């Protein structure tokens, strides 16, 4: 019937003065555009069909053509920035916002989907969708006593579009829009569907990626305990965004990191720092590094949870990026920690893996490791352990690596290695 039409026949049908022929041609276009194998988006655009689809969006007495045109425009807007721009130039944003209030659930869902693609293009189209007033009807669609009564796919699409309205930076979403959206986000964050939870955590991670004031906007709503709970979840698509959000939060002030700590997040890190997924380990070590850069009582809480041995393990064996994050965490620990805490760090066996990592070509990790060693040597000086630590470094082959670093391109590597040799190895 409407299967495998040529764009020529689609154009012929849409250009006819017969609403039913137009509907048939629009469904044929939808079926062309809904195939995985290279949907002919550019051919549909060149045929000048976008204005006709946008006009069909507003045919209230023919809901099927509304639905078909909405689906076609959704799939067109799902492509490159230029194709999304072609959709937007046709005036589709206000038409989709108007359709959000359609009495037909599938049409409003398709409008949500299209607006999600448009906003997900980037900052400019996101803020334009916002300026057209989509947030109010979007949130109204979710204003029900129990989210469970809503259709699953409908709720998932709503959550995804909202997350896209929270996404992207330079600029970040408007403050008032974020405040308007956040309560519904908090509610979605307690929903039971895995996809809704994952997309809500992704939205929260978007919103926490910025100045401490944005992190505060999010943290004030009291979502950190729920974020930790989800950090403990079994579904990787949930743990990943929850961990990203927690990391972004701990990049803020020490009080926000303390809010993360009080929720019990550290107890989850024995598994996260041994998670078989590389990215989970990497981001968990990055979070730990941003935690060890905090106050001394927070370093002490890291110690009490037995996470220093796990940092040693990650530093000993892990993907190289995770090892970079571990080196950064150790350097922050040693720069901000007490003498007792640095001595404990040494007692857990950090020296040997820290030295083994000095043979890597990455110059910045070498600088980081040398800074950590300098801090440890200061802590030892304060106790008179300088010689004992020097002997330990000699026994594991670290002295050879430092002596080799003396003749290194980077000025700071040069100078720091030479200074270590001159000050602690006579």
């Amino acid at each position: 019937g409407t299967v495998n039409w040529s764009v020529e026949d689609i154009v012929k049908g849409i250009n006819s003065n017969n609403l039913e022929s137009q509907l048939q041609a629009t469904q044929a276009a939808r079926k062309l555009l809904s195939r995985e194998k290279q949907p002919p988006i550019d051919n549909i655009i060149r045929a000048g069909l976008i204005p006709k689809f946008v006009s069909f969006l507003g045919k209230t007495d023919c809901s099927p053509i509304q639905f078909e045109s909405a689906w076609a425009l959704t799939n067109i807007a799902s492509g490159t920035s230029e194709q999304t721009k072609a959709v937007v130039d046709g005036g589709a944003i206000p038409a989709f916002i108007s359709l959000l209030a359609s009495p037909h659930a599938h049409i409003s869902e398709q409008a949500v989907w299209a607006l999600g693609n448009i906003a997900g293009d980037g900052s400019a189209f996101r803020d334009l969708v916002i300026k057209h007033g989509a947030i109010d009807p979007l949130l109204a669609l979710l204003a029900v006593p129990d989210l469970s009564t809503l259709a699953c796919g409908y709720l998932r699409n709503l959550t995804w579009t909202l997350s896209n309205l929270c996404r992207n930076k330079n600029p970040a979403p408007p403050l008032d829009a974020v405040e308007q959206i956040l309560p519904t986000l908090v509610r979605l964050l307690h929903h039971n569907d895995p996809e809704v939870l994952a997309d809500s955590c992704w939205a929260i991670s978007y919103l926490t990626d910025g100045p401490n004031e944005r992190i505060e906007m999010v943290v004030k709503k009291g979502v950190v305990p729920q974020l930790v709970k989800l950090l403990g979840a079994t579904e990787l698509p949930i743990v990943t965004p929850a961990l990203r959000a927690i990391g972004n939060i701990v990049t803020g002030t020490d009080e926000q990191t303390q809010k993360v700590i009080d929720a019990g997040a550290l107890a989850v890190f024995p598994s996260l720092l041994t998670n078989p997924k590389t990215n989970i380990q990497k981001e968990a070590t990055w979070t730990m590094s941003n935690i060890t850069a905090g106050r001394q009582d927070q370093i002490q809480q890291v110690v009490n949870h037995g996470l220093v041995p796990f940092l040693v393990g990650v530093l000993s064996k892990a993907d190289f990026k995770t090892q970079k994050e571990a080196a950064w965490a150790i350097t922050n620990y040693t720069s901000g920690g007490t003498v007792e805490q640095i001595v404990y760090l040494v007692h857990c066996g950090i020296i040997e893996p820290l030295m083994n990592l000095l043979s890597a070509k990455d110059t910045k990790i070498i600088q980081v490791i040398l800074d950590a060693i300098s801090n440890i040597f200061q802590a030892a000086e304060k106790l008179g352990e300088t010689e004992k630590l020097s002997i330990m470094i000699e026994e594991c082959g670290g002295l050879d690596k430092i002596e080799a670093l003396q003749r290194h391109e980077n000025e700071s590597v040069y100078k720091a290695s030479l200074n270590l040799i001159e000050k602690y190895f006579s």
């Binding site: 079926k31 809904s34 995985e36 959704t74 799939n75 492509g79 997900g120 980037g122 896209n164 996404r167």
Partner: peptide, 10 residues
């Protein structure tokens, strides 16, 4: 990050 956009496929 996850997909910015997604088409409705059938």
């Amino acid at each position: 990050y996850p997909k910015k956009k997604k088409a409705r496929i059938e």
